[PDB]
Every structure is written in C-alpha cells, then in structure tokens.
Amino acid sequence: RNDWHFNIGAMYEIENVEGYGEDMDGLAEPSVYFNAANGPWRIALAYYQEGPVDYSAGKRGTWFDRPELEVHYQFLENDDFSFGLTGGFRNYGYHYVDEPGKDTANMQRWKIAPDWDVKLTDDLRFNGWLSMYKFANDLNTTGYADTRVETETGLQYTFNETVALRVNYYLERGFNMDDSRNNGEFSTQEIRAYLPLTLGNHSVTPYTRIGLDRWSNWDWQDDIEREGADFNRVGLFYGYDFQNGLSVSLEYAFEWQDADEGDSDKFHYAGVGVNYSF
C-alpha cells in the first residue's frame, strides 16, 4: 500500500447575461469538493448549486443542486501513454419556481469517461477525455435527452518548461436511446485553444473557444425554445500556488455571438477557487 493524497476546496462561479447595456440576470454557482487518492485509485465527492444570484436577498427562480460521487482508476501512467477511467454518479435535484406545470425533480446522471495522454514526439502529445452519460428519472419534467456524449481531445505542443500550446476539438451531443423519447436533443462542436504559462508560482492560461456549429431541437434550450447559432469566447484562467498546499484560482471569460444584425446578448463568466492539498 502507498500514500493517501487529499484535496479539499471550494469555488464560487457567476454567469451573467449582458443586454441593453448592463448585467441582466445571473446565476450564482457555489460548490465544494473533497478528493482522496492512493495508488491507481481516486475518489471525489462534490456538492454544487446553480440558482438566481439574488435569490435569498428578496426573490427569484428555478434552482438546482447537484451532489456528486466519482471514482477514477489510472490503468497506465508513463512517459509514452497514460490511460485512466472515471465512473460517476450525480443527482440533479431541481426546484422549479418560474415553471408552470413543474414542481420538484430528481434526475440522476451516470457517467463513464476514459481519459488518455499519448506521446507523439518529444514536443507533441495527443490527449483528451471522452464521457458518456445516462440521465434517469423525471425526464418528462426536466426535459433532458436520456443519453449524452461529450469529449475534448487534441494536441499539445510544449515549447519549454514555461509555455505550452493546446488545441482541442470539443463535442457535446444529447440524444435519446429510447425511441419513445424525443426531448432535449442538441449538438455543439467547438475548437478550443489554450496557452498555459507557468511563471514561478503563477499559472496563467489565456484561451478561446471558437464555435464550429450548434443546433438544439424542439424540447431543448429554454423550454419554449432551442436555437442554433454559434458563439466565440475568450477567457483567462489565473492560478497561484502558495507552496504550502494552498492554491487559489481566478477565472474570467467573455462570450459573444458572432451572428449578424444589430446587437445580441453577451455572456460573462467569472469564478474564484481555493484548493488545499494535503
């Protein structure tokens, strides 16, 4: 038997829509997590919430919580190949306020996800993860498709110790395996690019996501909706490592619709995180 490694941490993320010259409504997304690792094994517990930012200070709407348990096993880990596998369980416990005909819901998500890292040359790596999810229970309420596939995979070129370029293909696709179901169906494809910099104890990663294509059909999106015009997004992740097990992270991203017309809604994403490693 080997050593236990532990992490605990907490994050607070905000999403805002910008329209008519100001922040128009936003979500607040507190979360916390704990993880424990030994040899090839890792287990992670987490609790996440998403609801209206000023929900407790007066009023607002639909929120959900999302307790989670994941287990990861590293099959291979070396220089030339790494391969690992996650199994996961979440509950989505929805509380509807906005919604007519809707009340509470509990829908589970089951996850199986390989992750890999393959050396192509001394400078170049092919890496990625791919996840399959099954959603179960309350789907008539939540409107989700029963199955989903998601992957980010691509190439990493390392310049030297301080800088690396990564460029990835991203896909997310919701579909129904049950012929009877037709809700929640969508597809999103992007290219994503990152320039992670390691400057002493600071980590700085500017990045961009370039929309390739997206569509959602009838059910999906905003109940009474479902769209299909693609977004660009630019962001910056900043990390700081205190060298005593403590680290903090700050993230900011801006997203707009390259679509044509007059104006259209934009989106801001911000996050602050803390991790303690022992």
Ligand SMILES: CCCCCCCCO[C@@H]1O[C@H](CO)[C@@H](O)[C@H](O)[C@H]1O
């Ligand atoms: C801080 C800068 C404020 C500039 C104000 C311009 C933003 C207007 O964004 C608004 O998005 C709406 C959603 O479709 C459009 O319908 C409005 O016509 C548009 O003005």
Ligand SMILES: CCCCCCCCO[C@@H]1O[C@H](CO)[C@@H](O)[C@H](O)[C@H]1O
């Ligand atoms: C679980 C991790 C801790 C997160 C709590 C950090 C403090 C959150 O603070 C919240 O900020 C909101 C705006 O974002 C305000 O609307 C709320 O009134 C305020 O409680």
Ligand SMILES: CCCCCCCCO[C@@H]1O[C@H](CO)[C@@H](O)[C@H](O)[C@H]1O
């Ligand atoms: C880091 C460790 C996180 C564990 C937190 C577990 C919290 C489980 O709390 C869950 O909250 C939901 C509220 O909608 C309910 O639907 C569930 O019945 C309830 O068990």
Ligand SMILES: CCCCCCCCO[C@@H]1O[C@H](CO)[C@@H](O)[C@H](O)[C@H]1O
């Ligand atoms: C800079 C942020 C890049 C996000 C890339 C998404 C794909 C992640 O891919 C991951 O790369 C890791 C190397 O860092 C490997 O350890 C993992 O096995 C691999 O799944």
Ligand SMILES: CCCCCCCCO[C@@H]1O[C@H](CO)[C@@H](O)[C@H](O)[C@H]1O
């Ligand atoms: C570093 C070794 C594990 C890499 C992560 C593989 C697990 C895939 O998990 C994925 O994590 C993503 C963030 O990467 C989330 O965006 C995805 O929704 C989640 O499915």
Ligand SMILES: CCCCCCCCO[C@@H]1O[C@H](CO)[C@@H](O)[C@H](O)[C@H]1O
């Ligand atoms: C390092 C380079 C990263 C960026 C690659 C972007 C490739 C964009 O690709 C294009 O994107 C458009 C999105 O509206 C589509 O309409 C085009 O048909 C699609 O081919």
Ligand SMILES: CCCCCCCCO[C@@H]1O[C@H](CO)[C@@H](O)[C@H](O)[C@H]1O
């Ligand atoms: C730090 C440099 C990144 C700048 C990104 C923020 C500026 C994006 O601004 C966006 O530009 C788009 C393209 O012209 C317009 O369609 C959007 O209306 C506008 O909000």
Ligand SMILES: CCCCCCCCO[C@H]1O[C@@H](CO)[C@H](O)[C@@H](O)[C@@H]1O
């Ligand atoms: C998501 C996590 C899935 C775990 C998949 C199986 C991992 C454990 O299985 C592994 O460990 C031993 C049994 O303990 C076997 O003898 C090994 O050969 C096997 O690789």
Ligand SMILES: CCCCCCCCO[C@H]1O[C@@H](CO)[C@H](O)[C@@H](O)[C@@H]1O
């Ligand atoms: C991602 C790291 C830096 C991102 C900075 C983006 C902040 C842009 O924010 C602003 O950009 C304008 C374009 O000038 C938009 O039209 C404004 O409405 C928006 O608030």
